Amino acid sequence: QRTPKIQVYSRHPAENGKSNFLNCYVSGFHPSDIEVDLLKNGERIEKVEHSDLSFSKDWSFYLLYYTEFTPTEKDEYACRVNHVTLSQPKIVKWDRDM
Amino acid sequence: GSHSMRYFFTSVSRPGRGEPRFIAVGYVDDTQFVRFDSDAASQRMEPRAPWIEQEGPEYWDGETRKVKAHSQTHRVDLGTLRGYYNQSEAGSHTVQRMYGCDVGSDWRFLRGYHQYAYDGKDYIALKEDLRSWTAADMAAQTTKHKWEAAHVAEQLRAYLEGTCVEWLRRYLENGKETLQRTDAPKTHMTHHAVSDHEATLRCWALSFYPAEITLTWQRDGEDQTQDTELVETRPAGDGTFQKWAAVVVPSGQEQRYTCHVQHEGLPKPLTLRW
Amino acid sequence: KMDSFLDMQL
């Protein structure tokens, strides 16, 4: 039972009014079954795709979840992750500088 | 510069209903090129890189047959390991398999691998000599005795030192425009005031390939471990990778601090200063 | 290309 490491970020430098890609990279987990959703102001984004399942040297899994978006000054984004190792869904807020 | 070709297989049992979930992926370095998903409608080995699409019908039928065969041996493996470990039939378990070869700076064979895991822990692994096995427990020792008697290692050795290396070199050539192109990190430094007395300097490394990179912070020419933060290397989603290293410094003393970047795309290390 | 040797069971 290994808990997932989560990183929420943009593909390109975040600029207001320009099309970009919102990423949620989950890694260092075991077992494989995991639930990841990207949120826009608290609501689930329907159009989210993901990479094919793979693993690291220590056998732990990694996946990239992404969606196309256009960042603005007021809109807040986050990544909601649930796994068997977690008693409650872990939400990580998106910071443009990280 | 060294190169590698890898294949990763994951089989997760479905005790409630049906056959196990099977996902297989192939890499050349940090570029995924093939896939197989047991839940997909095609039920074929599918291309994930533009340079592999040029391979003919014989290749795709051969790869589909081999991965479908693997899906069935791992289904059997899940059943065999449940028996060895005296586990319940009601629980869901995982069998993972990985194999591949590396080529050195001289472009010839460097090393080969072929290893397995059960529920995330080491089970059995082929050693570096490609002749012997490393068994973790007594269930794995049973597998080792059987595989050494059947001369399995010899069959894997022929592939790892021969066919694996030959096909990796072929891919590296057919996809050279991208595969042998080194993308050096696009670097810059940001400044964030934490207070009137302290500040955060963040050293960025963007849009690079391969994933292998080193970001180090220095104060007056010497390394600094204290008051630093470094996130792990993450994929941008377009085939490239990202990373950053930060440091908390006293305001007005930013000049003493330097960020050093090491990557295969940089002929000499990069030095950034605010 | 994958290994054509498939006769390996745990």
> Rounded to 5 degrees, what angle do the CA atoms B221, B224, B225 make?
165
Cβ partners under 8 Å of residue B262, min gap 6: B213, B214, B216, B269, B270
CA distance B221 to A40: 44
Domain with residue B140: its CATH number is 3.30.500.10
DSSP letter, residue B161: I
SS (H, E, C) B31-46: EEEEEEECCCCCCCCE
Cβ partners under 8 Å of residue B155, min gap 6: C5
- Phi/psi for B8 (5° steps) reads -115, 130
Structure tokens at C10: 């745990």
CA-based nearest residue to A80, from A47, A46, A44, A53: A44
Structure tokens at B86: 């005296």
The tally of domains found in chain A comes to 1
Query: What range defines the domain where residue B19 resides?
Result: 1-181
Structure tokens at A57: 């040297």
**Which residue, B181, B199, B222, sits at the end of a domain?**
B181
**Which residue, B158, B181, B204, sits at the end of a domain?**
B181
Touch A-C: 3+ C-beta pairs under 8 A: no
Structure tokens at B221: 């020419």
Residue A2, Cα to own-chain centre: how many angstroms? 17
Contact A54 B121 (CB under 8 A): no
CA distance A13 to A30: 32
Q: Which method resolved this structure?
A: X-ray
The resolution in Å comes to: 2.2
Residues B164, B208, single domain; the answer is no
User: Does an H or E element contain B245, and which?
Assistant: strand B241-250
Residues of B in contact with A7 (CB under 8 A): 231-232, 234
The tally of domains found in chain B comes to 2
A55–B contact, CB cutoff 8 A? yes
* Cβ B30 vs Cβ B213: under 8 Å: no
Residues B168, B198, single domain; the answer is no
Residues B137, B174, single domain; the answer is yes
Query: What range defines the domain where residue A42 resides?
Result: 1-98
Domain with residue B233: its CATH number is 2.60.40.10
Q: Provide the greatest CA pair distance for chain A.
A: 42
Residues B56, B174, single domain; the answer is yes
Q: To which residue do tokens 């010899």 refer? A: B154
Q: How many CA atoms lie within 13 A of B240 on its CB side?
A: 18
* Cβ B34 vs Cβ B47: under 8 Å: yes
Count A/B contacts: CB-CB distance under 8 Å: 67
DSSP-assigned beta bridge partners for residue B23? B10, B37
CA-based nearest residue to C3, from B41, B165, B202, B19: B165
Residues B138, B196, single domain; the answer is no
DSSP letter, residue B256: G
B25–A contact, CB cutoff 8 A? yes
Burial class (CB in 10 A: 0-12, 13-18, 19+), B126: buried
Which B residues, 206 through 265, put their C-beta within 8 Å of a C-beta on chain C? none
CA distance B238 to B240: 6
**CA atoms B2, B184, A17, A24: torsion sign:** positive
* Cβ A95 vs Cβ A76: under 8 Å: no
